[PDB]
Amino acid sequence: MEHVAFGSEDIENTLAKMDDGQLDGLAFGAIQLDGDGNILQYNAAEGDITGRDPKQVIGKNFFKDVAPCTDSPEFYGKFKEGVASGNLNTMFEYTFDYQNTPTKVKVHMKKALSGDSYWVFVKRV
Numbered sequence: 001m002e003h004v005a006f007g008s009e010d011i012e013n014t015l016a017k018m019d020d021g022q023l024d025g026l027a028f029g030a031i032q033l034d035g036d037g038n039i040l041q042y043n044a045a046e047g048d049i050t051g052r053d054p055k056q057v058i059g060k061n062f063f064k065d066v067a068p069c070t071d072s073p074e075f076y077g078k079f080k081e082g083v084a085s086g087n088l089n090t091m092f093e094y095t096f097d098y099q100n101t102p103t104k105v106k107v108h109m110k111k112a113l114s115g116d117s118y119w120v121f122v123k124r125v
C-alpha cells in the first residue's frame with residue numbers, strides 16, 4: 001500500500017503524475033478527470049467501493065455517463081465552478097445510488113498539478 005492519507009494537505013504533490021499501478025496502491029478511491037469530466041484514471045479502491053470496472057470506465061464521461069447521480073449542483077456544480085476558476089478544493093459527503101446499493105461516502109475534489117486534470121477522492125463513511 002502507498003502511505004498517503006485521505007485529505008492530506010499536499011495530496012496533489014504526492015499523487016502528481018502517479019501511474020495507474022501506484023494509484024491502485026492507495027487506501028481510498030481516486031479518480032482523475034479532465035475539465036469536462038472525462039475519466040483519465042480510476043483506481044482499484046474506487047472500483048471496490050462502486051462496483052465499476054476501473055479499466056472500462058476510462059474515457060467515459062463521469063457526469064453524463066458513469067455517475068448521473070452526481071449530475072447536480074451539489075457535486076457536478078461544485079466541480080465545474082472549480083474548473084472554471086482554476087482552484088478547486090472541496091470536501092463533502094454524498095450518497096452514490098445509481099444502479100447499486102446506496103452508499104454514503106466522503107468526497108474530496110482537488111485540482112491536480114498536471115494540465116486539464118482534477119482529482120476526485122472517495123472513502124466510505
Ligand SMILES: *C(=O)/C=C/c1ccc(O)cc1
Pocket residue numbers: 031046050052066067068069070095096097098
Ligand atoms: C451516482 O450516479 C454515482 C455514481 C458513481 C460514483 C462514483 C463512481 O466512481 C462511479 C459511479
